[PDB]
Amino acid sequence: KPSGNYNYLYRFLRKSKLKPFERDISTEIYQAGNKPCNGVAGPNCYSPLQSYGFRPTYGVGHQPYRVVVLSFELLHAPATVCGPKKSTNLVKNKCVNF
Amino acid sequence: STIEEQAKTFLDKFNHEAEDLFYQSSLASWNYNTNITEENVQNMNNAGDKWSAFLKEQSTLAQMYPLQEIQNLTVKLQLQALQQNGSSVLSEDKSKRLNTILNTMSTIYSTGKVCNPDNPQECLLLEPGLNEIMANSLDYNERLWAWESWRSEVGKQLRPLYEEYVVLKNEMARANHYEDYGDYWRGDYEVNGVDGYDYSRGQLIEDVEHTFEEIKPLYEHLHAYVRAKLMNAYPSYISPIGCLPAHLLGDMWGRFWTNLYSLTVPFGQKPNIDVTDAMVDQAWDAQRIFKEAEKFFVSVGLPNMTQGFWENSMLTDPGNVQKAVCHPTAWDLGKGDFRILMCTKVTMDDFLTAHHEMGHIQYDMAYAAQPFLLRNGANEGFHEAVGEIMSLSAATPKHLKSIGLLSPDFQEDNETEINFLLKQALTIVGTLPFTYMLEKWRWMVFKGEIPKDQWMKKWWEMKREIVGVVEPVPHDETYCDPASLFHVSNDYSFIRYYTRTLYQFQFQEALCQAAKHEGPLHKCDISNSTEAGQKLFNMLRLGKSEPWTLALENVVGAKNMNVRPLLNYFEPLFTWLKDQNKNSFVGWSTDWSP
């Protein structure tokens, strides 16, 4: 929207290196140092939440992009979600494999 | 921990929020440029409010971070820009007197109306009235009367505001680690905290007089030629030994000589290059103009310009339904959106300033990866440098012949190259000593070691020796004539139009030693050469994040100015100047006053 889809947010700070196979849902404030936040502070707490905006007059590197990441699992269990499509009609009275 | 990373994170948060705020402000600015309405006026009022408030509050909050404790010079210079208090170092009464005097002085300059001759139903402004009596007018007397009346009506309204302006700027800058407001103009042109390639503020001063005394004799010869030709155009009032009146140069301030081309034509049988005939026979409108522009981009080596301009901008007149202005501005929204304000028509000057604006757009996308403190040139002259380099390398018709833009019936003889070189010399080289003494004079005014009430007589008598121009009538100290300029009344950095004037030649040599191009430097085509394109790109993508001196070594190879490429750029014109005004007097004399 021209007002801007500011609902989407990201973290430009984090407590440590984000590990794979885990989603840190909480966006809790990563403190910089040398000073207490004394609650939630403007100049010296550095809340990591930042917005996008994503107005239609943005740029190609600023374009709202929809992302889906599919990840399989190699855990101790075989496959359950495959494509079993074979789909040949029928045959009869013919020397055939099947 | 360390306060360095705390300042870094504050810079990152400020840069992100400033990106969003300047995105809104630039969208508002473009909408005001294309349409001047009541709601657009409200939009600019709100944009100015939010922008000034955010900038002053972040500058106030940045003062708690120490400056020179960071080894990373990028965020150190980001703090240096951010912790600039500016006008915050003094109180509010001087600031509000500054606002009242300056806004009254600006609105007096903008609609300053000369209304002395004839009936007062007409009052000749810059574009409707002064442009038809200064750019083209075949009467010395009417030009003298109108220019003198204009100078009087500007002076008696501008001077009492400008004296307090000079005092206020000196006492503002003396608290912000500057010795004067001229030092603030040279504060951006300074490298401190970076080892080795040091640049200081007086270094640019001595560079300026060094360039003046270097390019003195070329100006002597072109002054002799233009004086000899204005003996033909304006006889019976100018002596061959003396100087020239400043209301006949084609520029009311005395700056340019661009329209003083037909009166000072080198060869009557051969004009300058005019490819516009095949354009008007070609139906080459603005859409095909920009298609040829992107073809020229690919031919030079630059990437093709993005579609984000196309659905966001227009290139022709929109009629009178919306209040768009035909001012060539390359607006950047700061979030990957580029817009170009230009009424692109079938006019060679419009195409060359379209080259200028799209070179500005190219340099805008060159620093695209940098944050909001760094999406600029390292000084203000780099944008105009890229634009004028693009304009000058686009001014060679050999590439137009090669791509088929110019038909092969034309040939580039020595006559046409002399015409083109005189056009370029009278356009931007003809104001090199003009910009020189105006910058030097405004420096030695704002530094304030000089007497106060004697500026006009000294300024009107020292112009007889640098450019060699004389006032026909004396001007008393009630005048304020140099403050009749857009770069003095609005008071912008006029060194930008000085130093860039050498940029567009010196980097030109840097773009012809990499293009494997020989002969005269003016006939250089950066097109069909990837090496010169990438060498231009090397300076292009640096931007603001580095000190400008460093960029000057990786494009040229010096801490100081590569002045001498000007002789390479103008060698056939210099030879023709030597062969032409050898018999006529070369130089000027102060005592001759018309």
Cα–Cα distance measured from residue B23 to residue B321, given in angstroms and rounded to the nearest whole number: 26
Q: B248: closest CA among B96, B148, B411, B135? A: B135
Tokens of A43: 């100049």
Q: Counting one residue from A and one from B, how many pairs have CB atoms under 8 Å apart?
A: 53
Please say if B357 is a catalytic residue.
Answer: yes
Token pair 């007097």 in the structure block, residue? B585
Classify residue B294 as exposed, middle or buried by CB count within 10 Å of its CB (0-12, 13-18, 19+): middle
CB-CB contact of B468 with B587 (8 Å) = yes
Cα–Cα distance measured from residue B452 to residue B447, given in angstroms and rounded to the nearest whole number: 12
Token pair 């070179």 in the structure block, residue? B359
Q: Give helix then strand counts, H and E, for chain A.
A: 0, 2
Classify residue B427 as exposed, middle or buried by CB count within 10 Å of its CB (0-12, 13-18, 19+): middle
B368 to A43: CB separation less than 8 angstroms, yes or no: no
> Collapsing DSSP states into helix, strand and coil, what is residue B341?
strand
Please state, in angstroms and as integers, the Cα–Cα distance from residue B183 to each residue in A33, B186, B192, following that order.
37, 5, 14
Q: What is the length of chain B?
A: 594
B244 forms beta bridges with: B469
A59 to B336: CB separation less than 8 angstroms, yes or no: yes
Instruction: Mark the breaks in chain A: residue after which each occurs, C to N over 2.5 Å.
Output: none
CB-CB contact of B590 with B461 (8 Å) = yes
Cα–Cα distance measured from residue B243 to residue B227, given in angstroms and rounded to the nearest whole number: 8
Tell me the DSSP string of B154-213.
Answer: HHHHHHHHHHHHHHHHHHHHTTTT-SSHHHHHTTSS-B-SSSSS-B-HHHHHHHHHHHHH
B1 to A61: CB separation less than 8 angstroms, yes or no: no
Cα–Cα distance measured from residue B256 to residue B435, given in angstroms and rounded to the nearest whole number: 10
Residue B570 is classified by DSSP as: T
Residue to mutate among B2, B4, B5, B6, with most A CBs inside 10 A, is: B6
Confirm or reject contact between A59 and chain B (CB < 8 A): yes
Q: B59: closest CA among B77, B86, B24, B91? A: B86
Tokens of B237: 């009032």
**What approach was used to elucidate this structure?**
cryo-EM
Tokens of B402: 């090669």
> What resolution in angstroms, rounded to 1 decimal?
4.6
